[PDB]
From a paper:
The biosynthesis of the lincosamide antibiotics lincomycin A and celesticetin involves the pyridoxal-5′-phosphate ([name])-dependent enzymes [name] and CcbF, which are responsible for bifurcation of the biosynthetic pathways. Despite recognizing the same S-glycosyl-l-cysteine structure of the substrates, [name] catalyses thiol formation through β-elimination, whereas CcbF produces S-acetaldehyde through decarboxylation-coupled oxidative deamination. To understand the molecular basis for the differences between [name] and CcbF, we solved the X-ray crystal structures of [name] and CcbF with [name] at resolutions of 1.7 Å and 1.8 Å, respectively. In the active sites of [name] and CcbF, the [name] is covalently bound to the catalytic Lys270 and Lys260 residues, respectively, to form internal aldimines.
Numbering used by the authors:
A (entry chain B): 16 to 427
B (entry chain A): 16 to 426
């Protein structure tokens, strides 16, 4: 499990094309050739679950736990664990009175359900303010009936956007005649890894309060900052929006805790928004599924292994950022072509000048097995995105292989 | 476990109201009093999984299997398994060339994604033809931008609707100026338990072909007919629509195989519709989740237990329909107040005349612990729906309690 070929040979090889993105074939060809493959382009930890988690899944054989459950909020032993755990972990305002609900099919799907909820009763053209680049929010915005109007997040900024970026996007809503339905923020940001500021959050809150527009917080990486980076807690700083029906946060558990297949998460915030989400806008569409996974996670999350695993992941993200930096320096990259902000486990690489970046991307897989992400800034300048949150057993050889590849890159 | 109170005490008791339907409180009060509770209103088998299925989850510890998958169609070992299994079980037309895809968050959710895919590119008002009553299709139709235009399915018909019912619905689309986007059918029908006819399916196919409208088949209960009832196979009879991009079926595995929490199912049919569903209209919304559950179910489906479990469920459903008929005759109900058609595991009870049916429904829980479903026909006449697909360990005491309740009813 020191590389990722096994994952593609099992989950991608099929008698149908597994997806039509060009990277699908790059990954297949590398994996089927049984050559080392390193997937640094998607933020997963597929190589292992945390200690104790699979055991917790098996322990739930003690009682029947594979039927549908009779709560629109998820399994109560999980829901109340998340309420306590999130309030402590994110340092929620004790004077706010939020409601917490389980999401059991992915927080991207919870965002979709939240956005279609906010389209209800809105005949007029509507906008969602969202970061660009963002983690797949754009299609959920379009598919739920809104216009995506993005605010720029520069890759170079260790703190992500500034209020001026939000204002520019708001002014495009003004001139396009689009009613703003939601402001979506991602303070520990995928893909750039910025840690967003109280300044920016206050600008978001002021716009929310002025226009009566809810804020949607994606906290997937709140718990995965670098060791020397204290995450900005948007729910703490925006606590006054809870009682105004202007705040909902979503936070995947399966990302931080290396169980992406279980698709468990928390939806929390204003009680009207969250109760409407949970029943009307989620449980009419999907079943009350995930009984066993929720019970296993309630037992696991209530114990001692979550803190140990989180501390491990944050120490790895820090060490891997440092190892990538020195590896790429030894390969000949200039210091300023390697950025790591510590708000989420991503390192950003400026691709070598003058080559077609998609070609460099493919040749890195073909020649050395490493698949990186590709993002672009507001002027379409390309950046490679390197996910750092793999176990060291995979990241150490992946880093070495990327060092081999980057020595073939020309920096002038 | 010979009742259901354990399930409500674990999954409904909380510091928030679990849902605002009045039945939530009836269920809580009975369960929290630790008096026998029998949930016969939802088609689940929460009391137990089939032999070998939980063991299959353990066996998957042998390799890492809790990350995201790199296929928009689900885990290949499951998808391949379902393709072969469905083609044999439903006797698909060997001349058709369908595509099969895994659904991993519920087939009601797959229907939602299919319906919103069919709204794409349609500014004009559009309709979905659907049965009334149906299993929750109506809100997916509305929430994906269509107008629900229902065709009547009479509870009394052991074969469900006739072509005239479909035509009446189509004519309402015509007079309202609604463009038909989809015809949804449920041949082994929830809630009435009819087994729909080749006649009706032929009328559906003729309408689909004439108007170029895809058919969406819900086959949740295809494998759960009574012992003496061969299910009508819509995909077999509609095989010619596959190549025309006019057929998609959805089939939950988790109902038949008593693992509803795993929310695994199959989406199958026209390759353009199914590939567009799988990627564009599902994987941009949902993560490629369910690795371990899909792997466990693929392994389990490769053994001998699934066929044994299915035979057992069908035997139980048939025995339970018989036991309810005898129990309710002894309680004083007329024969025409107790219907079981055998197309799915439901018995229909006509409530006592002159009582308020929601009151009778509540009092049956309060006094005897039995929760029945409530449906109505096209003239709003009420019927209780009794789910039969529970283990006998639960159903036998449930039937005794329902007999006790029904003896208090006036016929």
């Amino acid at each position: 499990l020191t590389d990722d070929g096994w994952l593609i040979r099992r989950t991608s090889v099929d008698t149908v094309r597994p997806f039509d993105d060009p990277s699908a074939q790059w990954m297949l060809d590398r994996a089927q050739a049984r050559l080392p493959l390193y997937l640094l382009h998607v933020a997963d930890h597929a190589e292992a679950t945390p200690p104790g988690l699979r055991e917790a899944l098996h322990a739930q054989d003690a009682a029947p736990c594979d039927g549908l459950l009779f709560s629109q909020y998820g399994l109560p032993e999980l829901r109340r664990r998340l309420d306590a755990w999130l309030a402590a972990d994110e340092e929620w305002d004790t004077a706010a009175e939020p409601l917490v609900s389980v999401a059991w099919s992915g927080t991207g799907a919870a965002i979709f359900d939240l956005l279609r909820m906010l389209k209800d009763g809105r005949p007029g053209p509507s906008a969602v303010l969202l970061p660009r680049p963002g983690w797949g929010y754009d299609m959920s915005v379009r598919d739920t009936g809104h216009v995506p109007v993005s605010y720029e997040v520069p890759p170079e900024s260790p703190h992500g956007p500034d209020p001026a970026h939000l204002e520019e996007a708001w002014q495009r809503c003004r001139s396009e005649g689009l009613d703003v339905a939601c402001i979506l923020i991602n303070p520990q940001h995928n893909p750039w890894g910025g840690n967003w500021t109280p300044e920016f959050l206050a600008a978001v809150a002021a716009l929310a309060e002025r226009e009566r527009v809810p804020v949607l917080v994606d906290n997937a990486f709140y718990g995965l900052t670098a060791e020397d980076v204290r995450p900005t807690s948007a729910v703490r700083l925006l606590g006054h929006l809870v009682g105004q029906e202007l705040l909902v946060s979503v936070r995947s558990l399966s990302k931080q805790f290396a169980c992406s297949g279980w698709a468990l998460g928390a939806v929390a915030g204003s009680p009207g928004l969250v109760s409407a989400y949970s029943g009307r806008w989620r449980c009419l569409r999907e079943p009350t599924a995930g009984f066993r996974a929720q019970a296993a996670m309630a037992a696991w999350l209530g114990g001692a292994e979550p803190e140990r695993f989180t501390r491990r992941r944050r120490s790895e993200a820090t060490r891997h950022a440092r190892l990538l930096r020195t590896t790429l320096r030894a390969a000949g990259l200039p210091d300023d072509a390697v950025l790591h902000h510590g708000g989420a486990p991503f390192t950003l690489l400026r691709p070598p000048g003058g080559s077609t970046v998609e070609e460099v991307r493919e040749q890195t897989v073909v020649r050395h097995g490493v698949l990186l992400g590709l993002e672009r800034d507001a002027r379409e300048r390309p950046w490679f995105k390197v996910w750092l949150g793999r176990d060291s057993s995979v990241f150490e050889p992946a880093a070495r292989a990327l060092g081999d590849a980057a020595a073939e890159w020309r920096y002038r």
